[PDB]
C-alpha cells in the first residue's frame, strides 16, 4: 500500500522530486521500484531500490539523471529527477519489486500515481 506524490509541470532541463510513501510503515524492509506510463507507450520500469542487498538500479534512459533513495524516516522512497526531458512526461507509479528483477512486467499497483509533464 504505496502512495505517490510530487508530480507537476516542469520546463525541459528542470527537476522534480517524487515521493512514494507507506505512511509511518517502514519501507526499508522492501525492494521498491518506480515505474512510468506515458501516452502510447507501455508501462516501463524507471528505477529500483534493493533494500535487501543495499543496491539501486536505473533504466538506461534515466541513468545519471534520476536517483532513487530513502531518508532517515525510512517510510518513504524518493525519486530525484534531474535534467528532465519531454520523453520523461508520464504518470509515475511505485510498487514492491522484489529483488529489482529486470525481466518482470506484472506488479501490484495500489497507487493512483503522480503525473509529470515536461514542456516549454
Numbering used by the authors: 3 to 122
List sentences from the manuscript.
One of these, referred to as BC2-Nb, recognizes a short linear epitope corresponding to residues 16–27 of β-catenin. In this study, we provide a detailed structural and biochemical analysis of the BC2-Nb and its interactions with the peptide epitope, hereafter referred to as BC2 tag (BC2T). The BC2-Nb adopts the typical immunoglobulin fold, which consists of nine β-strands forming two β-sheets connected by loops and by a conserved disulfide bond between Cys22 and Cys96. Similar to other nanobody structures, BC2-Nb features an especially long CDR3, which contains 14 amino acids and is stabilized by an additional disulfide bond formed between Cys102 (located in the CDR3) and Cys50 (located in the framework region 2 (FR2)).
